[PDB]
Design brief:
This is part of a larger assembly, with two copies of chain A, one copy of chain B (115 residues), one copy of chain C (53 residues), one copy of chain D (15 residues) and one copy of chain F (1109 residues).
Chain C lengths: L1 E4 L18 E6 L5 E6 L13
Antiparallel strand pairs in C: 2-3
Chain D lengths: L3 H7 L5
Chain F lengths: L8 E2 L14 H11 L2 H10 L7 H9 L2 E2 L5 E10 L6 H6 L5 E12 L5 E12 L7 E3 L2 E5 L1 E5 L2 E8 L6 E8 L6 E4 L7 E4 L5 E2 H8 L3 H7 L4 H9 L5 H12 L7 H12 L11 H9 L14 H16 L3 E2 L7 E2 L11 E4 L1 H26 L14 H13 L3 E3 L5 H8 L1 E3 L40 E3 L5 E2 L5 E9 L2 E2 L4 E3 L1 H4 L4 E2 L15 E5 L5 E5 L5 E3 L21 H10 L14 E2 L2 H9 L3 E2 L4 E6 L3 E6 L4 E5 L4 E2 L5 E2 L2 E2 L6 E2 L4 E4 L3 E2 L2 E2 L3 E7 L11 E4 L1 H4 L5 E14 L2 E2 L28 E2 L4 E3 L2 E3 L7 H10 L6 E3 L2 E2 L6 E10 L10 E13 L6 E3 L5 E8 L15 E3 L3 H5 L3 H13 L2 E2 L19 E2 L5 E2 L8 H8 L17 E2 L14 E10 ...
Parallel strand pairs in F: 1-56, 8-18, 24-27, 28-56, 40-53, 41-52
Antiparallel strand pairs in F: 2-3, 3-4, 4-5, 6-7, 7-17, 8-16, 9-10, 10-11, 11-12, 12-13, 14-15, 18-19, 20-21, 21-22, 21-23, 21-27, 24-25, 25-26, 29-37, 30-31, 30-36, 31-32, 33-34, 35-37, 38-39, 40-58, 41-53, 42-43, 42-50, 44-49, 45-48, 46-47, 49-50, 51-52, 51-58, 54-55, 57-58
Helix pairs in contact in F: 1-12, 3-12, 5-8, 8-9, 12-13, 14-17, 21-22
Bound molecules: zinc ion.
The structure holds one DNA strand of 31 nucleotides.
DNA sequence: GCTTGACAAAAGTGTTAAATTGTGCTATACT
């Protein structure tokens, strides 16, 4: 940071879009109705955009700083600071 | 069922009779990171790290391992028994002795604000 | 003022790199020929099939 | 007293 | 007139293929967050409801092609998908914008950072800052040109963290929490440190 | 005058022919008309009305009768009756009820096919009533409905000049207010076009033919103006039928053109009362303007056949230039152009009509389903209840009293504020003008305000000009036109034949001033008299030309403006400031009437209702601090409750104390108790303080004020302020949160003042951060960190399932608990859904005057208190009296408010009695003083009515006749100045200075409510910036102009640190806090959220935005 | 200083039982 000289803009050939995304949004559902956890493979999905709460996966198998950098073998969400949900993007593949 | 039937209200409404604020300019996060607490936590650990140093090597180790200040796992007595092949009862006795040492004002008065 | 919240409970752990755990990296190939990697934990078995980016 | 449209129309060429 | 548009692509780091999109990106969820208000009420960003509208169409298309639907239905679905993407990028540029509940359009991505609100604007209007206060003024004839009188409570509130550090340093308080409580209660020891 | 009437000698020279009418009549008469009270009926019939109809009856008659589509059934309503109110005012205010009364109406159903009749009384519901003070008790709050100002529907004529190729075009637009449009306009082609329904210009002859006119009649009657001859020449329509068909085709070409439907549509468009109405005020306006159907009463709500032709003829006359016109069947009327700012065209919607409109809407909504229930049910099984739903009307009336802009909280700061609020003329709201529109066009002072709207007193905020106040002598015409009284003048002698005229009625006469000298008999003593013409211009005319005369000099000022002495010496701007500042005076602990004032202090106090007045003659049975008992001559006891230490809507303490003793004879209308800002029945907004006009060491530099410490010691400027803190306990998805004395993770010393049930005891003293009522909520998942686990293992304090959420005293507030109110579902209280309990605690504090508190007089002189010197320091008179206040001299002449100096001089003259040497003969200056005013004792109170007050010469003469002091010497010489010793050095000041008594009042702009500060606190949910708008932890705004200033300074680092570290930089903000607390140097700022969010958004739009070095 | 036996509530075993969720199908004729 603090090392910028100029900022440039340009078109995206959808290769940039496929590079940015951490996973595609397969389904439209956002969150469960009685439980308030995100729905997998949809919007707000933790596997794609990251965990909602600090250093915890969806099922809770791996949690806390000691597991930092690990993808749960059952969820697919990687334990992280949970502030990364403001940084990771997805994509929708049009038929 | 009544509460389930409710529809979420758009976060981009026009609360205030006009467009000066929409809806969310006046919502506070109850789960906010508050600085004074966070910094205090970084101190508390240190204090404990110092206080547990006043104890003996063996007495300090059981408390650190029992509460997992290093790894975080609340190791049971049997696990702690592998330090020297010691049985659960001696480890429990050492833990109780250390608890008696710590809770005395001579040490507890230092930490008696982070409650 | 109005008050809101999420389900994202906050933690005050200061251990950005304090603790390091072992891990193993598996590699998967997609039907279209794209390859990806995943750093699984050294636990049980690596899944046979994985949903990639 | 004055809106954007009137303020914008205020400084037009008017010639 | 056409020369500038045609030359913009010649000798440039892009290609004419960028007009047509094979996939559309999705903004991170926290930038379109769903906040749970106190009392069970849910407040959602209307943008969240636009992306969904696309998926519902897109998935449907992916089914219609599977079973070999007639050309009319597939063309209608493709038209719906195009309109949905257009609404996602620009709500109201083509046709009439989707309204949703009430009688107001949903503000899409480009609706942001374009109007009175949104970046490139509202940053040159003024933001709120910490470590600041406001108060009525009186005429001080005893002051030097470089001095000003600041009320005690205002000064204490502004300098709280420094006062807490000094109190902890002078053994008045054992730790940060004790100094914070002492300042908030405004015990007599606070003013000596503040001065 | 009034029974009590404390002796207050007046300086008036003129005689008052008409007593000031009931100030609160506007708010009461309209409602009496709405409910059709008996007294209203007597007043209306005595005026010259036959079979008068009330508002409710009028609405019911308009709705009734209603017949179904089949035409076999009919429903009607009649005879609205009211019942006794459910509860009293005090009970309703205590229990947060609504002061209302049951309403009943007699409904009748008729079966046309058979003849069955069903008559029954249907419960309409609780109609919100009003008290005797013109206020509505809505949910335990005193709301006020302010009369609205709207443009009366009717026919208006205007003329503009074309800005393309010169020349002028005249137009007439008819505003019905409940239907479509109909206008005739003249183009620059010597023609007369009619644009029906504002669609497209059409020939006027087409409309004439459609009504049933032919070429022969048109050419025989409209033979005066040539333009219409040309229009008829251009006309292509031959017969009347074609005109209807042509109009129908032009209106809606889509539908098939047929003669029958063509006529029916035009018949339906304007000639039906169910689609097009004039609201029974447009008809009167058109009759007065055109002059048709004069004399006989009119009930039609449509356009008469002659009205349209008369309007067209008047338009062509106006273009022709004729100054007079008359048509058979009418009275000759003048010809001129009308304007929208004139009050012959602007009417007033009072509370009665405002409520009537909502009732009409509700009844229409009810009827919509009433007819459906008729068409869906079976016959011979239907009763009035089975087809009448009272839900919609009740919902509408409830919504109008809680959401409408016109109905808002009554300003309870002091009696004058409330009194002015009730008689307010707003020009906005539903059907009014926007707050961002009509700039310097509708907020200007029209020459018609004189006598009907105060032209000086008006808010200085966004609503300047849009909001005003009614004049002292003014009452709304039953039609809704503000009319003012005038004295009839015949043959140059003024007679007692007061007549109330409107603006248009006044434009046809010549009115003179009230101060014009007159002979003893009544004849004019002079020859040339100053008068007002029809154009709103002042001119000198002959004595015989005078037609009318003003009732009194203060006929144009309002109640608030009439309380300012020597108002004719103050500038308009300063007078406006003083008038608007007089409504912001906080009641003091001990009030005192002004030494110098006008005659409005008394009336304004009694009419405000903030006092208790005996209902009938009697003897005071007993007096206490809580109530007064009086025994009347008829043996009927009367008991008055005295509301004691009652909080006003704005936080000021409102209380009354008796001013009578046992055995005292009291007459009807006498004040027996006084309110917050009243003394002996007179308004006492402020205090009389000894003031010296001189600069003092720069402590009063730039309008600052220096005060003596005595005011602090003797509680001269002390006030009581009461605040309410409310908190609820409700059921939650994790359980029901309960209020409890027990609180987790807190010492037992903090809650030592809590009671058994967890509420602070009454009478306890509380500061910021104190617990008022305990409250806990279920927490849920704990998941303690190992640090916390070990910490609470050593301490042994086990986890608690509940979290503390007790109510705390907001920062900066302190006082004593004076009252506690508790509501609970356990006792069947009407709490909102899900709420189990509600607790309100009242904290009262004794606020003394202090530095920075605003302080002002009645002439627009305002200032903060820059310093409070000790008694010995203040300059003192030779007798040893220390002045109480010092006002800078530089600020008086510039602001152009010399009236304050006159107030000071006359206050000094009043404080120390005066004695004119009348033994040898009245001096020249005193020849005008009334006989009663030649000599008065010390501490006397005098009156100087606005525009008829003490002259400068008389005051100068009185200054030289003041009585001595206890020593026997005069402090103030003939010039109004006195020598002052310096309190610090002791040397007398080199020159004498002006010293006197000034009446000054404490404004609500106190420092305690205007101090803010932030170090770290709540942050926004979305923008992550500090939130504001509240005095607890609100942040300050750093606008773009401040950024420009910083850039100009070259202050790069400060601007960065202020735009990122202190706002929406979550990562670096905590690091900055940690560095400050640890003593480490602050780290370099990062990148603000406002940029990362922008980058992610711009990337989301398929834009490949990237950074590079 | 440290260990064995007797007890105990708490954390799991393993299956079954109840609640929840996804799913195809309704054939007077209706455009
Ligand atoms: Zn998991």
């Amino acid at each position: 940071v603090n090392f910028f000289d100029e900022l440039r803009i340009g078109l995206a050939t959808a290769d940039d879009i496929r590079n940015w995304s951490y996973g595609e949004v397969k389904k439209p559902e956002t969150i469960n109705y009685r439980t308030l956890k995100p729905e997998k493979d949809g919007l707000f999905c933790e596997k794609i955009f990251g965990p909602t709460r600090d250093w915890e996966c969806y099922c809770g198998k791996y949690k806390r700083v000691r597991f930092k950098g690990i993808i749960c073998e059952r969820c697919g969400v990687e334990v992280t600071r949970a502030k990364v949900r403001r940084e990771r993007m997805g994509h929708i593949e049009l038929a | 069922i009544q509460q389930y039937a409710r529809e979420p209200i758009s976060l981009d409404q026009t609360i205030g009779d006009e467009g000066d604020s929409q809806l969310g300019d006046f919502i506070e996060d109850s789960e906010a990171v508050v600085a004074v607490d966070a910094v205090s936590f970084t101190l508390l650990q240190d204090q404990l790290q110092s206080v547990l140093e006043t104890l003996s090597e063996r007495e300090a180790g059981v408390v650190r391992l029992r509460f997992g200040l290093t790894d975080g796992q609340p190791r049971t007595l049997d696990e702690i028994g592998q330090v020297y092949g010691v049985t659960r009862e001696r480890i429990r006795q050492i833990e109780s002795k250390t608890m008696s040492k710590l809770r005395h004002p001579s040490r507890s008065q230092v930490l008696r604000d982070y409650l | 003022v109005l008050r809101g919240s999420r389900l994202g409970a906050v933690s005050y752990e200061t251990d950005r790199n304090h603790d390091l755990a072992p891990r193993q990296v598996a590699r998967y190939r997609t039907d279209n020929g794209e390859e990806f990697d995943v750093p699984f934990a050294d636990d049980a078995e690596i899944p046979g099939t994985w949903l990639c980016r | 007293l004055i809106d954007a449209e009137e303020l914008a129309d205020r400084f037009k060429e008017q010639d | 007139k056409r020369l500038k548009v045609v030359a913009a692509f010649q000798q440039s780091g892009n290609s004419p293929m960028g007009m047509v999109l094979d996939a559309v990106p999705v903004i991170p969820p926290e930038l379109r967050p769903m906040v749970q208000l106190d009392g069970g009420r849910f407040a959602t960003s209307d943008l969240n409801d636009l992306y969904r509208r696309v998926i519902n169409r897109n998935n449907r298309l992916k089914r219609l092609i599977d079973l070999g639907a007639p050309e009319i239905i597939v063309n209608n679905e493709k038209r719906m998908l195009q309109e949905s993407v257009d609404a996602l990028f620009d709500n109201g540029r083509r046709g009439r914008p989707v309204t949703g509940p009430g009688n107001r359009p949903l503000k899409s991505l480009s609706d942001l950072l374009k109007g009175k609100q949104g970046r490139f604007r509202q940053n040159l209007l003024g933001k709120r800052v910490d470590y600041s206060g406001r108060s009525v003024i009186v005429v001080g004839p005893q002051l030097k040109l470089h001095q000003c009188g600041l009320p005690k409570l205002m000064a204490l509130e502004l300098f709280k963290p420094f006062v807490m550090k000094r109190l902890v340093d002078l053994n008045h308080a054992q730790n940060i929490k004790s100094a914070k409580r002492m300042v908030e209660r405004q015990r007599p020891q606070v003013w000596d440190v503040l001065e | 005058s009034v029974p009590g009437a404390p002796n207050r000698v007046s300086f008036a020279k003129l005689r008052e022919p008409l007593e000031v009418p009931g100030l609160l009549d506007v708010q009461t008469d309209s409602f009496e008309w709405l409910v059709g009270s008996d007294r209203w009926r007597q007043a209306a019939i005595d005026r010259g009305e036959e079979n008068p109809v009330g508002g409710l009856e009028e609405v019911l008659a308009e709705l009734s009768p209603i017949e179904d589509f089949s035409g076999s059934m009919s429903l009607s309503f009649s005879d609205p009756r009211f019942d006794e109110v459910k509860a009293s005012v005090d009970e309703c205010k205590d229990k947060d009820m609504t002061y209302a009364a049951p309403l009943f109406v007699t409904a009748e159903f008729i079966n046309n096919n058979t003849g069955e009749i069903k008559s029954q009384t249907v419960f309409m519901g609780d109609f919100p009533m009003m008290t005797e003070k013109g206020t509505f008790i809505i949910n335990g709050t005193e709301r006020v409905v302010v009369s609205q100002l709207v443009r009366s529907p009717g026919v208006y004529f205007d003329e503009t000049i074309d800005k393309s190729t010169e020349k002028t075009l005249h137009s007439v637009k008819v505003i019905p207010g409940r239907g479509a449009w109909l206008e005739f306009d003249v183009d620059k082609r010597d023609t007369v076009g009619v644009r029906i329904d504002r669609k497209r210009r059409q020939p006027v002859t087409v409309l004439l033919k459609a009504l049933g006119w032919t070429n022969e009649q048109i050419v025989e009657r409209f033979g005066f103006s040539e333009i219409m001859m040309g229009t008829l020449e251009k006309d292509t329509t031959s017969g009347t039928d074609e005109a209807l068909l042509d109009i129908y085709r032009k209106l809606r070409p889509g539908e098939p053109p047929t003669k029958e439907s063509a006529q029916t549509l035009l018949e339906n468009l304007f000639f039906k009362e169910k689609r097009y109405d004039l609201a029974r005020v447009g008809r009167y306006k058109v009759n007065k303007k055109l002059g048709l159907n004069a004399g006989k009463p009119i009930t039609s709500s449509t356009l008469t056949e002659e009205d349209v032709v008369a309007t067209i003829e008047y338009l062509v006359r106006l273009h022709e230039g004729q100054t007079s016109m008359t048509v058979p069947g009418g009275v000759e009327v003048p010809v001129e152009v009308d304007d929208i700012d004139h009050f012959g065209n602007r009417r007033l919607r009072t509370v009665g009509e405002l409520i009537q409109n909502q009732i009409r809407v509700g009844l229409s909504r009810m009827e919509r389903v009433v007819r459906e229930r008729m068409t869906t049910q079976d016959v011979e099984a239907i009763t009035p209840q089975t087809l009448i739903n009272i839900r919609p009307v009740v919902a509408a009336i409830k919504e109008f009293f809680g959401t409408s802009q016109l109905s808002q909280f009554m300003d309870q700061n002091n009696p004058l504020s409330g009194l002015t609020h009730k008689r307010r003329l707003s020009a906005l709201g539903p059907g009014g003008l926007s707050r961002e529109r009509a700039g310097l066009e509708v907020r200007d002072v029209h020459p018609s305000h004189y006598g009907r709207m105060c032209p000086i007193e008006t808010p200085e905020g966004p609503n300047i000009g849009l909001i005003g106040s009614l004049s002292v002598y003014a009452r709304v015409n039953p039609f809704g036109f503000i009319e003012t009284p005038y004295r009839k003048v015949e043959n140059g002698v003024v007679t007692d034949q007061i007549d109330y005229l409107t603006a248009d009625e006044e434009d046809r006469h010549v009115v003179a001033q009230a101060n014009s000298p007159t002979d003893e008999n009544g004849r004019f003593t002079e020859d040339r008299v100053m008068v007002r013409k029809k154009g709103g211009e002042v001119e000198f005319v002959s004595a015989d030309q005078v037609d009318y005369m003003d009732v009194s000099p203060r006929q144009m000022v309002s109640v608030a403006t009439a309380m300012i002495p020597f108002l004719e010496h103050d500038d308009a701007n300063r007078a406006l400031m003083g008038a608007n500042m007089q409504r912001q005076a906080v009641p003091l602990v001990r009030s005192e009437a002004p030494l110098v004032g006008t005659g409005m202090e008394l009336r304004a106090a009694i009419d405000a209702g903030d006092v208790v007045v005996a209902d009938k003659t009697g003897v005071i049975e007993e007096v206490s601090a809580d109530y007064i008992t009086v025994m009347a001559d008829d043996g009927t006891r009367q008991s008055y409750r005295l509301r004691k230490f009652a909080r006003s809507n704005h936080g000021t303490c409102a209380n009354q104390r008796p001013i009578v003793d046992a055995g005292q004879r009291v007459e009807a209308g006498q004040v027996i108790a006084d309110g917050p800002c009243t003394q002996n029945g007179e308004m006492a907004l402020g205090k009389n303080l000894l003031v010296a006009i001189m600069p003092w060491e720069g402590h009063n530099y730039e309008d600052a004020i220096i005060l003596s410490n005595r005011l602090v010691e003797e509680d001269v400027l002390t006030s009581i302020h009461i605040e309410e803190h409310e908190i609820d306990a409700r059921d939650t998805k994790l359980g029901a949160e309960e209020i409890t004395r027990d609180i987790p993770n807190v010492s037992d010393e903090v809650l030592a003042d809590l009671d058994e049930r967890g509420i602070v005891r009454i009478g306890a003293e509380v500061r910021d951060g104190d617990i008022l009522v305990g409250k806990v909520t279920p927490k849920g998942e704990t998941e303690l960190t190992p640090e916390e686990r070990l910490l609470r293992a050593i301490f042994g304090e086990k986890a608690r399932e509940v979290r503390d959420t007790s109510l705390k005293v907001p920062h900066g507030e302190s006082g004593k608990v004076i009252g506690i109110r508790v509501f609970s579902r356990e006792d069947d209280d009407e709490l909102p859904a899900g709420v189990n309990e509600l607790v309100r605690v009242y904290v009262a504090q004794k606020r003394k005057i202090s530095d920075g508190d605003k302080l002002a007089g009645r002439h627009g002189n305002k200032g903060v208190i820059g310093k409070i010197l000790p008694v010995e320091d203040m300059p003192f008179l030779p007798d040893g009296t220390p002045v109480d206040i010092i006002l800078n001299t530089h600020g008086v002449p510039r602001r152009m408010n010399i009236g304050q100096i006159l107030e000071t001089h006359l206050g000094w003259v009043a404080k120390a009695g005066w004695n004119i040497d009348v033994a040898a003969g009245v001096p020249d200056w005193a020849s005008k003083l009334p006989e009663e005013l030649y000599s008065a004792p010390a501490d006397s109170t005098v009156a100087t009515p606005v525009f008829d007050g003490a002259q400068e010469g008389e005051l100068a003469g009185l200054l030289g006749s003041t009585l001595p002091n206890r020593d026997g010497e005069v402090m103030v010489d003939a010039d109004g100045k006195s020598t002052l010793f310096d309190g610090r050095s002791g040397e007398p000041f080199p020159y004498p200075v002006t010293v006197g008594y000034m009446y000054i009042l404490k404004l609500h702009h106190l420092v305690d409510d205007k101090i803010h500060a932030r170090s770290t606190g709540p942050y926004s949910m979305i923008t992550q910036q500090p939130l504001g708008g509240k005095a607890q932890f609100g942040g300050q705004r750093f606008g773009e102009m401040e950024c420009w200033a910083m850039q100009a300074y070259g202050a790069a680092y400060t601007l960065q640190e202020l735009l990122t570290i202190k706002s929406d930089d979550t990562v670096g903000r905590v690091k900055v806090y940690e560095a400050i607390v640890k003593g480490e140097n602050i780290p370099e700022p990062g990148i603000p959220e406002s940029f990362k969010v922008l980058l992610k958004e711009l990337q989301s739009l398929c834009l490949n935005v990237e950074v590079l070095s």
